[PDB]
Each structure stands twice: as C-alpha cells, then as structure tokens.
Design brief:
By secondary structure, the chain is mainly beta. The protein folds into 2 domains: about 100 residues, Sandwich (Immunoglobulin-like), CATH 2.60.40; about 100 residues, Immunoglobulins (Immunoglobulin-like, Sandwich), CATH 2.60.40. Helix content is about 0%, strand content about 55%. The strands form 5 sheets. Strands 11, 14, 15, 18, 19 and 20 form a 6-stranded mixed beta sheet that branches. A 5-stranded mixed beta sheet has the order 2-9-8-4-5, with no helix packed on it. It comes from Homo sapiens (Human).
Length: about 200
C-alpha cells in the first residue's frame, strides 16, 4: 500500500509584468497521499507578497506573487512533494518585466471583468477581452485558485469569447475573480472583480 509521490500538475516558467501577478500551480499524488510545499533555495516561501494557497488536502499548492517586483522576484522556485516513501522536486522560473520593456506582443487586457451582481439561480457572465501576439489563451482564477470549467459538472463554462459564465449562481459562487491572458511572450492579470449574489 505504498507509492512514491509524482507530480500530476507541474508548474511552468512564467514571464510577468512589474506590478502584476504570477501564480505557479503544483500538485502531486502518491500513497500515502503527499503534501506539496513551495520553497526558494531550500527555504520555505512565505512573505507579504509571496502567499501560498493549499488545496486538495495540501497535495496541491498555488504560489501567488503580487505585486511583482523586478529584479527582486526573478528566481527559480521549487515545489517539493513528499510522502513517507519519497520526496521529489520540480522547478519553476519567474521572470519580471518592467512595463517599459514589454515586447510588442505581450498580452494585454482590452476589457477586464467588472463587479458582478446576480440574483441567486440566475446566469452570470463575466467578460474578458484580451489582445496579444500570438492571441493569448484565457484562464480564470477565483479567490487566488484556478477555475476549472470542465471539472465543474456543468456549473461553470468558459465561452469562446474568453468570458466566464456561472450557469445557476449560488452563494458559493461569490468571490474574487481574475482573468489571465497568457501567450509565448508572457502573462497578464486583469484587475479583480467581485461577484455578489442577492436573494431570490
Ligand atoms: Cl464583465
Ligand atoms: Na503554473
């Protein structure tokens, strides 16, 4: 009844903007079920601008850096997965550009999401118009954690337009949403938008 840890979600190198945000996502499995931790050069990652959000019983961890500082935050970071029969490591590098030195094709948020208010049970759609070259792929974060529409059992859909849609809004859907535009050139976060649900 034992299996060493293995990464099922590995963090990727990122290129962010000064003042913006970067989130590295790391997740592992194994038996016993492992914990994952974020470190830098062996030391635990934890400061005012560096927060970790654990999920999946701590077998998952998001490292959110905000606001980004250059060149302070330009480093390699480590996600360490550990259980009783193994400890493994994956690396993710962070690059931080000044707004001044952004390449022309760097993702830009033409129109980010706004404060959303919706009557419980009704559909709420939050828009995100992003530009870039290549055309950025759009993802969303809720309360610092990545949203996964496909794993939402149909409660949440990402539209072809990049918009996030809640099919039948419940109180649980309230929170702080951010859209993220990512391409070969780097990553840019929209300003956050809160979603509030009002009584039916
Ligand atoms: Cl919107
Ligand atoms: Na990542």
């Amino acid at each position: 009844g034992e299996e060493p840890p293995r990464f099922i979600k590995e963090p990727k190198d990122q290129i962010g903007v000064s003042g913006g945000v970067a989130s590295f996502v790391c997740q592992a499995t194994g038996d016993p079920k492992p914990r994952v931790t974020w470190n830098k050069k062996g030391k635990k990652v934890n400061s005012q601008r560096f927060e970790t959000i654990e999920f999946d019983e701590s077998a998952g961890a998001v490292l959110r850096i905000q606001p980004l500082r250059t060149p302070r935050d330009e480093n390699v970071y480590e996600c360490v997965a550990q259980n009783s029969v193994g400890e493994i490591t994956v690396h993710a590098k962070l690059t931080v550009l000044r707004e001044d030195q952004l390449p022309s094709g760097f993702p830009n948020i033409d129109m980010g999401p706004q404060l959303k208010v919706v009557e419980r049970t009704r559909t709420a759609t939050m828009l995100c118009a992003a530009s870039g070259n290549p055309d950025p792929e759009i993802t969303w974060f809720k309360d610092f954690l990545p949203v996964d529409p496909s794993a939402s059992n149909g409660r949440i859909k990402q539209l072809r337009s990049g918009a996030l849609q809640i099919e039948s809004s419940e109180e649980t859907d309230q929170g702080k949403y951010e859209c993220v535009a990512t391409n070969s050139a780097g990553v840019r976060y929209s300003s956050p938008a809160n979603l509030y649900v009002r009584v039916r």
